Design a protein around this ligand. Structure first.
Ligand code: MG
Ligand code: MG
Ligand code: MG
Ligand code: MG
Lengths: 395, 395, 395, 395
């Protein structure tokens, strides 16, 4: 049988400016233009999410070198504190292990960090290592990750675009456009009117069939979300996303019940592990779960989260994670379409989602992506040599 | 990247005499010695399960030849009627497909047979094909199946033994002994006393720590099972298995609630798909689910069933399926120990579980199985040339 | 009215060796002596919790300097990664604020870190800052923290002692002794017998009335915990703590239902926020919630958690946090007794809980602590000059 | 540390004519002009609430003198019978106690009156003493009560006005207008038509965005309330308040379910303690709880009620209690806006809510109140020397 290499060393680097950390941006970007958030109730933190620190972490790069010379890697959000965790804590569970010990390594990472993990940063870190491991395994086997995950179930991926210009997204071939909500509860009725006006304007431009969705980034309360959803019915809003904070399971269940018949309620990008998603599904909190592969626990855990959704006959549409989501969703019956975040400042052109960190990163063409483009080993990308890496720790 | 072969042809064969169909035995075997079943209420069908036709199907052998010459295969219960389904119906979804299209092929087999499937024989058939596909993928990758399923999470498997001699199993290093219940409700109080006498005798021989369990093969009613469990508490019975018919979800939940504190209720060998097991788990029907990989939908579906169990923090101890279960359970955190069926007529020695069909089949060595022993490609076994195959159908 | 000062600067430091991070110990300590944990299923990580990295973070020291010269501080678990969060992210919400803006500062810290927080390390960090804020407010007001929290409701605190020697704790005046469980599920029946033997031995030494408890540090599964509790009834075990991982709300509810009548099930030291505890209380997961003030969100959030418990008429016995818990529990009707960790290596004498970091730290005197002893401003302690602080980051 | 004074004496006085007892009015006031109540079914008690005795108690004034000369006080509804309770019963728990023993004193007051308390008058009395204690503590510390309650979370309070002239309230800067319902179930369809006509007239005058609410003072039945709410949908009614009697928890839950999507159901001004509000929240009886600080148990208990609402992510908008509510709500994230009762006979001008009892009482200016106006110690008000006090009892 094939001689399986062992893991020689694990390394963590930090990278800043775009890439995995969607919000690690500069000035003039739609993704930081008055997005409604839980902090919006404070005027001083309403115009910019960066002002309250959404960009304090940056990107965590994890590299895993095997005894055969192969090197797998992945990028996610975490930066220096995450690098500390990788170098000082998690490395011990990987070094010396066979590259195929995926399930065992994940279990040790999760159980060993349980005392300060469960959700958030620690899970982001575990996800990063996990992705790097799958990248390495793919490289060792000389096959793309989708083939290690049961194979694709569709010949191409179809995308909806997230950004402030759903009208421009339609012209680019996308199947729908998810817009950021710009006004929250603290802006009262005037803000609600402005929210609905924005949706109305886009509906007029795109026609009655193009999909339109609202992303609320955990910024509303039950009543406001209920009224926004009801008011959006007139414009055929397909779904309302992350209306409430992730810990409010009860509120999501109520919102889904009070929502217009046919309109979906989605959430999950800030939820983690099979247990977090079990709570969402069992309490009937949403119609679509949206875990981020780089934050929910990685591919190993997403496989379990996905199977849970399968049993619940629920749709799983991961929070756009570049090739990390593309390789995964291609193999899932429960993920008929995918999210493509428009990282161009004015959302007026398609650019790689994790630009400029990944070389070889495919992007939708007329809103689609042929599976044939994901034919390289692992996740099929290489780290851009132009991105200055920083290794804050060693072990 | 590696050149993935396509599937050239699928073939179905029938084999009789032992093997995958555990009950396809001759005379004098403990496995057919007055085992309590739902038919026990009829004196004419009480002594032998073969009398009511538990051995009417025999073994289904599925072979899948790839364009590179590799041939994967698997064995399960189904015989001629299953071969008909494989050759006349399922073959079309596999031939021409890339060997890595596992998820897509499974979905097509299940959705195309829904009108006459869901559970039973049709799922057994789908499972056999699925197993042959995983064997083939392992051979193409030149790796044992456990490495394709996330890698082992333990260095060895530990087994409990199923048969009429738990005392002898103890001497052979097994961690426990599950014995068949010989008397059902129609045999009244005398039968109940006999059941408890057999347990008492074995408990006396093995000491207070050795695990002892009762397998009831769907033969009881709620009250009888309740009383049997209570009476068995005095002997520290670890669990009572398949006390009721598979369709009685409600009864299982009630039984589990009325069971002695600490004693477990298990079931599942006659349950199929992620949805069947979701019902068992959500309704609180059992403490351990026991799907048979060759009957529940195969490895592909068992992965999803297992993930569901993970979310429910439930134990999964698959019904023994020789190498097909060994390779799978080795990779699951939720499967700490495994079942080994004692197929020797008097359960007084260890013999290959699927004897005589599988050459190279590993047997437990003093109740354990080092993972280092499962180092060959696929499921690591070959079809015994001695077994005369029969090809009932072609396509 | 009193002139309220503003916050001039917040600083984060890292300290190693004992202190707030209970597990940051050296060799020969009972607290690292074969404690049962979720990693115990791996022989390599069974003897020492330090081997899997329970001591990788160390202590986070937060200092908050006000415009009047007063400086509040606190210690908790978090180290360098937590310091990064404090300096690079949280500082902005405090500097310039009036020292009395506690509720507003907490809300901003939590809502600004939601995208990578909710539980774990980020909450530990928020908790440390919150504790330093309360220490500062107490110093500005020139009053002990208990007087800022509604005043004491008892004249003295009474403690139960946690460590491997409940017998010695009895001789030192404590009201009970909580001992660490040393064997988990992977150690089977032999381990279960050993666990019960240790309990039996201690019960024999202390008599039938002295309280005895078992701390399981998230290491069991439902069935094992069920059997351990039943076996411990013979020895009058008062409660079984953290039997299951924090994310298994469903399992806890089941365990509490199957627990011996009168025996309590407790958990919560690894749970955070009002919402995490709402889930525990509403689902009937435990009889006593045990949040750690330095990990659950700080005093500000613990006040809300405590009020929730009040409505549920539930007991709240916070995980011991030295003066940070003493000042809080003294004011709560729902916290009749408190936890005191025996940090002496052999748990054979009383030493300061957060030794050697806090000068002026009060120790129980014959198992009790008169409130008259907590008469100094804030939390009444000073940073030990001996401890060499490290300032990893600035802002 | 600061030397904390003790309580020297507690005194209770009675005051009549306006003030704390909102309904202790004379002729010609909107607050007594055909308000719908549970007694409305009797024609003789329909025109005036005073006719059935809503004004039989008057105001209870509680004074607490400390050893340092400081004197705290508060006003609420209770009069002579409440004074009896204060002087003859509650005084014993306060005199001799340190002014900071807030939690202990409250507990003793509640537990000692449990046999004839729980809700109603007795709790009003406890609330009065509790407020006087917080006023005293604020005076001793020389800080406004909001700073003792975690500090303000907003720079100003925004108010909606309660009275028969929401149109005039809009012109005065208020954010909304809550109108009293004038017709109940016994007036049949004619009365329902008149109720909706009144709402229609006000909606025409104020425009589509100004908030309009209906206060029903416990006067309806489930069906009538359901039909009124449905009929008010046309006029964008924001919420329907106290539709049913306080003991009908089941009815409130049903009403909230049958209510127009987006319209809120509120109640609680006649509910008391953490347990009363737990029942409301857990049974899903309302979207907003409206405890009166002077009737629900005081600030000490409202802190617990508020925390409960926090866990339930529910809005808390206290039933206008002058400075007693202002100081509290300023510190709560869950109380974004406040109620201001228009005590002017024709609701055509702003006058102090507790006029003429409190000197130094702030009032909304153009519908808002800067937190800077609540800068005096305690609740910042003094008893008006012109109000003839009466001390019916001594002890
Ligand atoms: Mg989103
Ligand atoms: Mg069985
Ligand atoms: Mg503990
Ligand atoms: Mg009202």
């Amino acid at each position: 049988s094939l001689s399986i290499p062992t893991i020689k060393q694990v390394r963590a680097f930090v990278l800043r400016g775009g890439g995995a950390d969607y919000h690690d941006q500069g000035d003039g970007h739609w993704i930081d233009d008055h997005i409604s958030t839980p902090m919006g109730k404070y005027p001083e933190y309403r115009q910019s999410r960066r002002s309250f620190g959404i960009n304090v972490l940056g990107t965590l790069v994890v590299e895993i070198e095997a005894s055969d010379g192969n090197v797998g890697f992945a990028v996610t959000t975490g930066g220096e504190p995450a690098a500390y965790i990788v170098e000082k804590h998690l490395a011990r569970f990987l070094e010396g292990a066979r590259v195929t010990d995926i399930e065992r390594i994940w279990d040790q990472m999760y159980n060993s960090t349980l005392y300060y993990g469960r959700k958030g940063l620690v899970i982001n870190t575990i996800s990063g290592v996990d992705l790097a491991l799958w990248d390495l395994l793919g490289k060792v086997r000389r096959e793309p990750v989708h083939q290690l995950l049961g194979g694709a179930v569709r010949d191409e991926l179809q995308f909806y675009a997230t950004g402030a210009r759903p009208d421009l997204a339609q012209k680019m071939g996308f199947i729908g456009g998810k817009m950021p909500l710009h006004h929250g509860p603290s802006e009262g009725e005037e803000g609600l009117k402005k929210n609905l006006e924005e949706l109305a304007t886009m509906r007029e431009r795109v026609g009655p069939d193009f999909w339109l969705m609202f992303d609320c980034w955990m910024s509303l309360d039950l009543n406001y979300a209920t009224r926004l959803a009801r008011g959006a019915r007139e414009y055929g809003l397909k779904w309302i996303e992350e209306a409430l904070p992730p810990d409010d399971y009860w509120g999501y269940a109520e919102l889904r019940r009070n929502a217009p018949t046919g309109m979906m309620v989605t959430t999950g990008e800030h939820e983690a592990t099979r247990w977090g998603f079990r709570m969402l599904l069992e309490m009937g909190c949403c119609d679509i779960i949206q875990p981020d592969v780089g934050w929910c626990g990685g591919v190993t855990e997403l496989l379990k989260i996905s199977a849970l959704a399968d049993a619940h006959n629920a749709l799983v549409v991961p929070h756009g994670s570049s090739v990390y989501s593309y390789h995964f969703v291609a193999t899932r019956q429960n993920s008929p379409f995918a999210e493509f975040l428009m990282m161009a400042p004015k959302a007026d052109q398609v650019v790689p989602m994790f630009h400029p960190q990944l070389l070889g990163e495919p992007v939708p063409e007329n809103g689609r992506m042929r599976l044939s483009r994901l034919d390289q080993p692992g996740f099929g990308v290489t780290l851009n040599p132009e991105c200055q890496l920083h290794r804050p720790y060693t072990h």
